[PDB]
Swiss-Prot record, chain C:
Gene3D superfamilies given in the database record: ATP synthase (C/AC39) subunit, domain 3, V-type ATP synthase subunit C domain
Source organism per UniProt: Thermus thermophilus (strain ATCC 27634 / DSM 579 / HB8)
Role description: Produces ATP from ADP in the presence of a proton gradient across the membrane.
Domain of life: Bacteria
Alphabetically ordered keywords of this record: ATP synthesis, Hydrogen ion transport, Ion transport, Transport
Family statement drawn from the similarity comment of this UniProt entry: Belongs to the V-ATPase V0D/AC39 subunit family.
Molecular function, one GO term: ATP binding
Pfam families in the record: vATP-synt_AC39
UniProt gene name: atpC
One Gene Ontology biological process: proton motive force-driven plasma membrane ATP synthesis
SUPFAM superfamilies assigned: V-type ATP synthase subunit C
Protein name (record): V-type ATP synthase subunit C
PANTHER family assigned: V-TYPE ATP SYNTHASE SUBUNIT C
Length: 649, 73, 320, 73, 72, 73
């Protein structure tokens, strides 16, 4: 049941406006509203508060940027009431430290990466050119080149002085150090011809490709012998900066987010010169908290607890769910989709009354239930450890309250798969073979079975009729509920569409069961009379056309509930056949390679577990999502999501 | 049994498989455009699901003809 | 190869663009609020400091990171159909390098905004004894310039008439390459674009009176030779004759500014139709041309915000 | 006279294979758009696995008709 | 002994045609996977899991084949 | 009795050929994207070969079914 969501109107003076918006934002259970057009101004806030707002946003952005620079992630904490320039003196030195160190070490890694890849060719050409460092007669064209194609680049030197003009590659065969030395203009033109044959001079950034090679090689030796020490020390100092700055910086981040949220919501008011007024929405189970919070102020400044205006002109109303706590943890599973419109039916209790009971009819293996109970006790130990669940393969990081809801749905699901593993009679596929624990008359060993599910002459017609019968109950409940919601708002087309689909569907079902099912064509024909008469009456008193092609898809939606028995038989006899092959070919072939067949059947059984339990877990909830939720509407105008004053904490 | 029981079964199974091929051809392109419209923003979910699962009437019709042929023998 | 794979990424990126209330509220501020409002969006990922070269470098770098990726990520027919959208940049860089080789100013002279080719090709493609060798090292296989520059290279080595016939050959070759495969939403778009191109060429060559049929091309459909000639000579009922075509409100327009405004609006309107085809090439077209419209409107609003121009000078230029 | 078991078995195999081709044709383009949404950002994970696992109804309907035929075999 | 071959041509038809179905699936999914790997190395596990998800087709085809083998 | 060896052989050949068609349709676009990735860079060679040689599972399963039928023969 959606909460009735009353209206809250307040007024007063403006210093008290900021103070009561503080006291309303600390107890954050209220939604806001613009309230522009009548008798008040749009409330351009203040110039000095605008400067304070943009400075607070700069504080928040700088703190979060410092934190992401530090490498950790931004979680809230409890804030601290302290002065703004005190927050500046808290923010700026650690920001200066981390910013100077992330300049220093990142440019150090740049210089170290450009150094270590080119130490040895540079030192090699320095030992080769120790008779001419920067002598003013002949430039030294360096080219760290490929393998033994030295004549292809030395053809330019052959075009140059052949009995002179020393150009070769001595050693260091990772890259052949083709050095060329003749003159200034001779080496320039021969370097142009060698670049036409493919060549390039060592002109890099930093100090190597901007200075003479001897002293630059000495500087590269200096950086190679110095830089890992600074690597280790700057990692140590950033670790210390993390461990003794992250708490206070994310605390002031929480404070800054609170201040920015309050000031940006402060413009949602309406005032002139001797007072303001604002409007908001409060759910009805939040009235004593807001009442005692607003009892603090000046002369208990005047509240208007309006009962909200009704379903006409009601699209701007926020929506919540408010379900009893036995059905509570499916709110995320019903809120993957959109939200209702405050006057649409609360859809959430039917998924606890149906979905685990359908998943039991999907999965009828006691071994699957025991493995689910094992992962459930693991996952409840994980919420005992209070760790957020993280996996970077899926980039799935999520908080332990969702994980506790997952514990609840997993337990409330695994009970029904236990009881439908009992009734269907399958232990881990089929381990009734050795110990005949389940009683069929072909090998009666122990307690009987209710339905065998491996053969179809005994099972298929009964199970397929019950699988259609659940869809009959579901779809008739959905169409009756749409007729109810059309009866509520005094909107008549929804009522006619609901009663028309109901009459047409029961008429088609009666005609099917009569003229294609059994004998006794006498009693049901009056029901066919009634059903098609109601359908024609609806189309005549409706004029809401193109329902006539929908009734075929509507029978499709009442009939598409075969898939629960379909994947039930599929997964059931698949598991039974796998354990049958493994158990038989292990036991009756060898009698001591039985552990070989047992563990390979176990690992293939867990393989098909891991490879199709996602699919036949997804099937009942898509059955709900595309039959039942779309019968009674639920896909119109998206509602409006209730977000209160946060106070992020 | 004879040729009767054998040939009604392939008349069943051909109908099921070929109607399944039809709705696979439909849901391929409709699921492509649906995954697109969801990947823009998480707001078109209630319309992508109904436009995606409009073509399953074909395979329930295939199962209808199949169960008629199953009860026929 | 697969159109749906690229279309998913393009629809994700189309999910993140700037709304109308952004510039409608950024129509009156003083450039610090502009830096403020661009601090949040996806263009702020490359904004280094503050000022006009910072904002321009940020817009060009984000457009190269967010638009210049989709000519990759597919292989074959999909890249052959998507590469013919963002290919004006390659023509601009190639004609800048052509005039730089024909001038003598150094190779580090131009700035060379990124198109579809890596810049090592540009660094290698200045020194060549034969300009056919320059077109050969420029040649990635199915490229329009790689088969257009060698097509109209068959007269001389390096002239300016070569550049004029390069522009004409480029337009007709892009139109023929649009006709040469099956995309029902891109052939009509490029025909309408090249019709817009030679129409505004005829408007910006009014009054001269030189031979128009050497400048008029083939590949458009709304105009022909006689409308081109009677539009180059001064009577504008022919520009009033174009009705039924998407040139709808564009009638009686004389000056270049209102003309080019109307042509840019009708190109963005007819190129926003590409959601008609949510599987083929229409959606990436409606992404890329909307993205360049948003980029140049962001640039013009930046100029107004910095230099304090009146909003009555800009109000006509956010009309579409 | 003996033309029963083989022909109901080839009906079984034809139904299974042809429905398998149907959901392969569906999951091809749906998984292509799914990977196109995944490899941009890893926040579309569950809302692409739902669309990939959605067309697995077709082979299990074919398996339903197959297991009915095996019950009659 | 006349129907002993036709159960086997049904077996082979199920195996081959389900192999065709998941080949059609793995075509586009592996093309998208190789595109994502050619973008970056960081999409390895998602490419492998989306590529190995449509093997349901062929393991169900082997299920039908081993049904028709266990009958014979 | 006859007319069994030929029919298990045409089942064998149809299985091998049609599974070969399946992995051919797969390796068409997979090897196309692989050659495109190799033409972009040589760094991603081994991952291209492992995505190209993943669908050999199809044909070793097809040869498994063929050799099961031939051992039955």
């Amino acid at each position: 049941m959606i909460a009735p969501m009353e209206k809250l109107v307040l007024a007063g003076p403006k210093g008290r406006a900021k103070e009561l918006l503080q006291s309303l934002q600390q107890a954050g259970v209220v939604h806001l509203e613009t309230l522009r057009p009548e008798a008040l101004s749009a409330y351009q806030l203040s110039p000095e508060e605008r400067a304070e707002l943009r400075r607070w946003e700069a504080v928040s952005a700088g703190a979060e940027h410092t934190l992401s620079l530090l490498g950790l992630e931004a979680e809230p904490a409890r804030p601290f009431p302290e002065g703004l320039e005190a927050a500046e003196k808290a923010l700026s030195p650690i920001q200066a430290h981390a910013e100077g160190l992330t300049r220093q070490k990142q440019e150090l890694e740049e210089e170290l990466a450009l150094a270590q890849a080119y130490l040895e060719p540079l030192e090699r050409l320095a030992a080769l050119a120790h008779g001419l460092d920067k002598s003013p007669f002949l430039r030294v064209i360096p080219f760290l080149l490929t393998e033994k194609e030295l004549p292809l680049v030395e053809e330019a030197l052959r075009k140059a002085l052949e009995d002179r003009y020393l150009l070769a590659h001595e050693a260091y065969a990772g890259g052949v150090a083709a050095l060329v030395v003749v003159h200034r203009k001779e080496v320039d033109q021969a370097k142009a011809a060698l670049s036409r044959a493919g060549v390039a001079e060592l002109r890099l950034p930093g100090a190597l490709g901007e200075l003479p090679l001897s002293e630059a090689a000495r500087r590269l030796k200096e950086r190679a012998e110095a830089a890992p020490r600074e690597l280790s020390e700057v990692r140590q100092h950033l670790a210390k900066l993390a461990r003794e700055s992250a708490s206070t910086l994310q605390s002031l981040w929480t404070r800054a987010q609170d201040e920015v949220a309050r000031l940006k919501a402060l413009e949602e008011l309406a005032s002139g010169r001797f007072g303001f007024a604002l409007l908001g929405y409060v759910p009805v189970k939040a009235k004593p908290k807001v009442e005692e919070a607003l009892a603090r102020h000046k002369e208990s400044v005047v509240y208007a607890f309006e009962p909200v205006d009704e379903h006409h002109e009601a699209d701007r109303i926020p929506v919540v769910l408010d379900n009893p706590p036995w059905a509570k943890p499916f709110e995320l599973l019903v809120s993957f989709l959109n939200t209702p419109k405050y006057g649409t039916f609360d859809p959430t209790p039917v998924v606890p009354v149906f979905f685990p009971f359908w998943f039991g009819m999907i999965v009828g293996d006691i071994g699957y239930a025991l493995l689910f109970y094992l992962v459930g006790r693991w996952l409840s130990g994980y919420v005992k450890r209070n760790e957020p669940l993280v996996i970077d393969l899926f980039a799935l990081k999520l908080k332990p309250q969702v994980i506790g809801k997952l514990v609840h749905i997993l337990n409330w699901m695994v009970f029904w798969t236990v009881v439908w593993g009992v009734i269907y009679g399958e232990f881990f596929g089929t381990f009734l073979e050795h110990l005949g624990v389940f009683g069929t008359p072909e090998h009666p060993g122990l307690i009987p079975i209710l339905i065998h599910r491996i053969d179809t002459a005994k099972t298929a017609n009964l199970l397929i009729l019950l699988s259609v019968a659940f869809g009959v109950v579901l779809v008739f409940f959905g169409l009756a509920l749409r007729a109810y919601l059309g009866l509520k708002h005094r909107h008549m087309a929804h009522f006619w569409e609901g009663v028309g689909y109901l009459g047409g569907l029961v008429g088609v079902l009666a005609l099917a069961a009569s003229y294609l099912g059994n004998l006794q064509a006498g009693w049901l024909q009056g029901l066919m009379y009634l059903g098609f008469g109601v359908f024609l009456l609806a189309v005549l008193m409706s004029r809401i056309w193109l329902m006539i092609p929908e009734i075929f898809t509507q029978a499709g939606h009442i009939l598409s509930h075969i898939r629960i028995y379909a994947v039930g038989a599929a997964g059931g006899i698949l598991a039974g056949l796998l354990t049958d092959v493994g158990f038989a070919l292990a036991e009756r072939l060898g009698l001591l390679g039985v552990l070989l067949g047992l563990l390979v059947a176990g690992v293939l059984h867990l393989l098909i577990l891991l490879l199709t339990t996602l699919g036949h877990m997804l099937q009942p909830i898509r059955l709900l999502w595309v039959e039942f939720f779309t019968k009674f509407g639920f896909y119109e105008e998206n509602g409006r999501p209730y977000r209160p004053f946060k106070s992020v904490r | 049994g004879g040729l009767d029981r054998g040939l009604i079964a392939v008349g069943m199974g051909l109908a099921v498989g070929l109607a399944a091929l039809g709705t696979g051809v439909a849901q391929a392109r409709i699921g492509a455009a649906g995954v697109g419209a969801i990947a823009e923003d998480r707001s078109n979910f209630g319309t992508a699901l109904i436009f995606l699962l409009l073509p399953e009437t074909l395979v329930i019709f295939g199962l209808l003809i199949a169960f008629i042929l199953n009860g026929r023998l | 190869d697969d159109f749906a794979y690229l279309n998913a990424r393009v629809r994700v990126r189309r999910g993140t663009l700037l709304k109308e209330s952004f510039f409608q509220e950024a129509l009156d501020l003083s450039f610090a609020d502009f830096l403020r409002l661009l601090s949040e969006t996806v263009y702020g990922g490359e904004l280094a400091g503050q000022g006009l070269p910072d904002v321009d470098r940020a817009v060009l770098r984000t457009q190269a990171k967010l638009v210049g990726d989709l000519p990759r990520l597919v292989t074959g027919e999909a890249r052959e159909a998507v590469r013919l959208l963002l290919l004006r940049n390659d023509l601009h860089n190639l004609q800048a390098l052509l005039r730089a080789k024909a001038t003598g100013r150094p190779f580090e002279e131009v700035l060379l905004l990124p198109g579809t080719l890596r810049e090592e090709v540009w660094r290698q493609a200045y020194e060549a004894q034969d300009p056919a060798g320059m077109a050969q090292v420029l040649a990635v296989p199915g490229h329009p310039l790689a088969r257009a520059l060698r097509a109209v290279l068959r007269e001389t080595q390096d002239l300016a008439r070569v550049e004029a016939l390069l522009a004409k050959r480029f337009f007709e070759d892009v139109a023929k390459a649009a006709k040469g495969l099956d995309q029902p939403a891109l052939r009509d778009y490029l025909a309408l674009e090249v019709d817009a191109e030679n129409l505004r060429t005829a408007f910006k060559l009014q009054g001269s009176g030189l031979a128009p049929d050497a400048f008029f091309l083939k590949g458009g459909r709304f105009v022909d030779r006689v409308r081109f000639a009677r539009l180059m000579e001064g009577d504008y009922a022919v520009l009033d004759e174009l009705s039924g075509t998407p040139f709808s409100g564009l009638s009686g327009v004389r000056d270049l500014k209102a003309l080019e405004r109307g042509l840019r609006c009708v190109l963005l309107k007819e190129a926003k139709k590409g959601v008609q085809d949510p599987l083929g090439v229409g959606l990436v077209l409606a992404y890329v041309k909307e993205r360049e419209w948003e980029a140049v409107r962001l640039r013009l609003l930046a100029r107004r915000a910095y230099f304090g121009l009146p909003r009555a000078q800009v109000e006509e230029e956010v009309v579409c």
